[PDB]
Design a protein around this ligand. Structure first.
Ligand SMILES: [Zn+2]
Length: 42
């Protein structure tokens, strides 16, 4: 059940393409990208 929202996310993660209504919410997210574990390499 996901519906009904107000406002937009002027911020988006260039790494994957995520969104964040806040500027700090994104910065903290970009972290997960910078350095991580997993065979997903390229
Ligand atoms: Zn991302």
């Amino acid at each position: 059940g996901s519906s009904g929202s107000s406002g937009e996310k002027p911020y988006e993660c260039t790494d994957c393409g995520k969104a964040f209504g806040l500027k700090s919410q994104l910065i903290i997210h970009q972290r997960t990208h910078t350095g991580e574990s997993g065979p997903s390499s390229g």
